[PDB]
Ligand binder design. Structure first.
Ligand SMILES: [Mg+2]
Ligand code: NA
Ligand code: NA
Ligand code: NA
Ligand code: NA
Lengths: 295, 297
């Protein structure tokens, strides 16, 4: 049972993990165009503002649904356009450290991103639990896509919005690779957001990455309460803000319009690829959230 | 025993060790009150962290601090033609931030004035009080025995909203440490491990006397929210995250020289007779040492 599975992070001395009721194993029916009350008590079937998404993405309420024990989400071409309509849902309740959040999900066999992530209300702080481009092959680029099919991006962002700036860790360990082709099975992707300066990523119950300390979380001081981006002044906040849980798929600009201009580095679904619906359906069996509490 | 050889009582953690910071000072130079000189001035400004001249009857003065005989020293005198009291205040020229252990060896004044070693953010919203103590045996202004306070060390922290003004600190009984010691008789060590924005440990003479940990005690009212301060339904609290100036001073505080009650029996501030004893109104700090935890190589 999903609640029998141990949480792999360490709750602390004389602490245990307490299941949060905002968790969801999607064992109800929620038709795409009429979600119903069970879905809507925990989830909104859009992004947390009216932005319809990055690159060719045009998020739609009716591109998410739940059936057969899973949250499901699929992609179709927007008629008369290059855009792709796609699913996006957001939690109605926010989460904050310390918290362990884990999704059992099956990365799409698609060049589109399959995402489970966290985002603060003011869009300045982000934790990416799963961001993965799972296709075996890409017709757009005309190449084997196993460079990406075997990788899971595990990361976090801090932003300045006024003029837009974006930081994330870029070291090699931010892309986890086993030999596992992620699209073949459901896997568990989790994060222990322990405090503003410490993140631990777990895949299938195993610690795969620790992101700890100021130098890697916010070296450019984008989280300064006073004068963001100024490293002479330290009023850094770290990842402190409560966050919405977001599950979506995305066409991202660096993929559909790559900086190089080359078709060979352009990874986005052709119409032929979109005609296979299962390949472009992201499935989440469950998402569970625990908080550490005193024994 | 050497100030740098004394073990730091806070635990650096697994695979960590304590690294002495050069902004520490054992005050083994001369710095005349009215002309401090270059050794003092590389580490310290001989005033508060802005131009504000202090609370209550306080009127801070550059020339009421000095260093001599191995000590930072600071004294109080009545302002000519006034009830106000001229007194010392210095602040560090470099700021500190968690994780950090900061400890002063200091002798609390035998005076109703506050003897203070504390930390304060540049924007005045966040404050950590390592030592705040009112050390007099007796108060001639109140006409009573002052041992209620002479045996207490206030160890605390504040978070503020500037507009409109709101002040939160922990008010439980443990925020005033008392073991029978009369703090004004000897130099003692007063330290804080500011470990992270939600965790403080207070050490006196190398012993853990108090731990202030968690959101419910550090900022239960959400004064450190980044958006909508004071709104407890929204959680963007930062805790004690902001880098801070080190401040060492004495103070006449308003709650003492003009108490809420309006009563002379609750009024604790020096008379002219008491100020005439210079030693009683001289705060001495032998040293202040600052360590940061670093990974062992
Ligand atoms: Mg004694
Ligand atoms: Na397991
Ligand atoms: Na399920
Ligand atoms: Na002295
Ligand atoms: Na000294």
């Amino acid at each position: 049972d999903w609640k029998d599975i141990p949480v792999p992070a360490d709750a602390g001395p004389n602490m245990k993990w307490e299941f949060q009721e905002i968790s969801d194993n999607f064992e109800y029916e929620a038709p795409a165009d009429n979600k119903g009350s069970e879905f809507l008590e925990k989830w909104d079937d859009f992004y947390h503002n009216a932005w319809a998404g990055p690159g060719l993405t045009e998020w739609k309420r009716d591109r998410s649904y739940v059936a057969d024990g899973e949250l499901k989400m699929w992609a179709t071409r927007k008629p008369g356009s290059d855009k792709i309509n796609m699913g996006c849902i957001t939690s109605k309740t926010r989460v904050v450290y310390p918290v362990y959040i884990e999704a059992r999900a099956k990365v799409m066999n698609s060049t589109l991103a399959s995402d489970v992530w966290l985002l603060s209300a003011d869009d300045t702080q982000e934790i990416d639990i799963l961001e993965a481009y799972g296709a075996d092959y890409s017709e757009s680029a005309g190449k084997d896509h196993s460079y990406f099919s075997k990788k899971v991006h595990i990361s976090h962002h801090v932003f300045i919005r006024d003029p837009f700036q974006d930081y994330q860790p870029k070291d090699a360990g931010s892309w986890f690779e086993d030999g596992t082709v992620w699209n073949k099975e459901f896997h568990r992707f989790g994060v222990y957001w322990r405090d503003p300066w410490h993140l631990e990523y777990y895949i299938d119950g195993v610690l795969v990455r620790t992101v700890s300390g100021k130098d890697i979380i916010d070296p450019k001081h984008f989280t300064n309460t006073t004068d963001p981006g100024n490293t002479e002044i330290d009023t850094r906040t770290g990842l402190n803000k409560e966050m919405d849980i977001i599950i979506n798929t995305e066409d991202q600009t660096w993929r559909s319009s790559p900086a190089s201009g080359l078709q060979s580095n352009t990874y986005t679904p052709t119409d032929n690829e979109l005609s296979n619906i299962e390949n472009n359906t992201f499935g989440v069996d469950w998402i569970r959230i625990y908080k550490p509490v005193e024994k």
